[PDB]
Design a protein around this ligand. Structure first.
Ligand code: NA
Length: 129
């Protein structure tokens, strides 16, 4: 599913991402924009042979099982395919674990490079939340 910006904002808020670990909703929407362009089905291969899955490009190196990332962990205890569903519940639950790991949203390199320090409130502008 390709979410609308305000559609994804509402879904993230419903699932308790708004101000989770102190990150405002706009941070999460900005991260999803640059990770996936709001596409739940987004997959990208990393140089290390790990793969990033779903709206928040969660990495098989640590967080989900895809069976093809040698030496990897599955800390969200989920198949990486569950991160591609039209229902973002699994992505959000796993994102809560990632952002709690000690480096906050710096875990998402595209958040650090493209959202951090910017006017992230713009991403929820005009949304009925
Ligand atoms: Na894994």
């Amino acid at each position: 599913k390709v979410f609308g910006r305000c559609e994804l904002a509402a879904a993230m808020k419903r699932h308790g991402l708004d101000n989770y670990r102190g990150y405002s909703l706009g941070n999460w929407v900005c991260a999803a924009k640059f990770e996936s362009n709001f596409n739940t089905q987004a997959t990208n291969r990393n140089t290390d042979g790990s793969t990033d899955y779903g709206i928040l490009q969660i990495n098989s190196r640590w967080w989900c099982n895809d069976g093809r990332t040698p030496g990897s962990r599955n800390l969200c205890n989920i198949p990486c395919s569950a991160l591609l569903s039209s229902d973002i519940t699994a992505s959000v639950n796993c994102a809560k674990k990632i952002v709690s790991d000690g480096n906050g949203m710096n875990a998402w390199v595209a958040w650090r490079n493209r959202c951090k320090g910017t006017d992230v409130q713009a991403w929820i502008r005009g949304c009925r939340l």
